[PDB]
């Protein structure tokens, strides 16, 4: 369906085997499926057709808000309240977007496990690696900021991480 993006939410092609009956006995599942189609599917399809006809007469649109980029807390001067405000709001929006990214990856993982069923350990290794990488990066970014997290605290954590990486590189080169 065009409701969502297939590239963002991938689904493997569906391979349904053709029925190969070996007995003359009638299939109760087939008979009940025919009954369900006759009694339920047709009336609900007619109702949805009427509703969609009524919708098409009043077609109106809504838009997605776009935020232009602004200088971040690194560029802001010390105790420059306006630049700090803009940078903090931008960091909070980025935090929300990153959280939704992790949510999308987790949904991929869950859906793939359920779809694979009994062979999930081998067939879901591709989605497990992506989740591992994304969770690792997200944890390193926002792991222990606290209840009163802020762009300044995230920047301080990044500075500490960069100093540690530089020290490790120097020690390895020594």
């Amino acid at each position: 369906p065009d409701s969502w993006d297939k590239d963002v939410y991938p689904e493997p092609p569906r391979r349904t085997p053709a029925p190969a009956p070996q007995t003359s006995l009638p299939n109760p599942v087939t008979y009940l499926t025919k009954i369900f189609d006759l009694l339920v599917d047709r009336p609900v399809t007619l109702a949805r057709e009427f509703i969609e006809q009524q919708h098409a007469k009043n077609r109106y649109y809504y838009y997605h808000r776009e935020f232009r980029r602004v200088p971040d807390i690194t560029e802001c001067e010390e105790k420059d309240i306006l630049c700090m405000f803009e940078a903090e709001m931008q960091w909070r929006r980025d935090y929300k977007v990153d959280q939704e990214i992790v949510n999308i990856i987790q949904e991929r993982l869950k859906a793939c496990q359920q779809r694979e069923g009994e062979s999930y350990r081998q067939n879901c290794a591709k989605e497990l690696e992506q989740f591992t990488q994304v969770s690792k990066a997200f944890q390193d970014r926002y792991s222990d900021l606290g209840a009163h997290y802020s762009a300044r605290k995230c920047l301080a954590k990044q500075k500490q991480r960069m100093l540690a990486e530089r020290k490790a590189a120097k020690e390895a080169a020594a």
Binding site: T74, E78, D144, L145, G146, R152, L155, A156
Partner: protein, 121 residues
């Protein structure tokens, strides 16, 4: 006494001539309205103490209460605003005249400032 003995201060002068250059309080000032409210409360308490009908009796007396409170409040607000303007003027002049005491400092961005990170866990 901080602003007592300030040069050029005329004694026993509620409002000097140099205060005439400031914007007078608006008559609809929230502080003036609160002074009127205090006057009305005083009138109601007067009626209650003298055992007259609190909201009905003594309308002329209540009006005088409100008017007197608003009058004194207007003059008090003028004096308060003048004194605060005087304080700001003196502070700015002193900062201007003592640059070695109030030096401009180079502003370092948070990219250059190093702050310790304390994790919450």
């Amino acid at each position: 006494t901080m602003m007592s003995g300030r040069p050029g201060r005329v004694p026993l002068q509620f409002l000097p001539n140099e205060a005439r250059s400031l914007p007078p309080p608006k008559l609809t000032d929230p502080r003036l309205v609160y002074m009127g409210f205090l006057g009305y409360c005083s009138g109601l308490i007067d009626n209650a103490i003298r055992r007259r009908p609190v909201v009905s009796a003594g309308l002329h007396r209540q009006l005088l209460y409100v008017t007197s409170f608003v009058f004194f409040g207007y003059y008090l607000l003028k004096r308060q605003d003048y004194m605060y303007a005087l304080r700001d003027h003196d502070m700015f002049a002193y900062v201007k005249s003592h640059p070695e005491d109030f030096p401009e400092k180079d502003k370092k961005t948070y990219g250059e400032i190093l702050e310790e990170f304390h994790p919450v866990r």
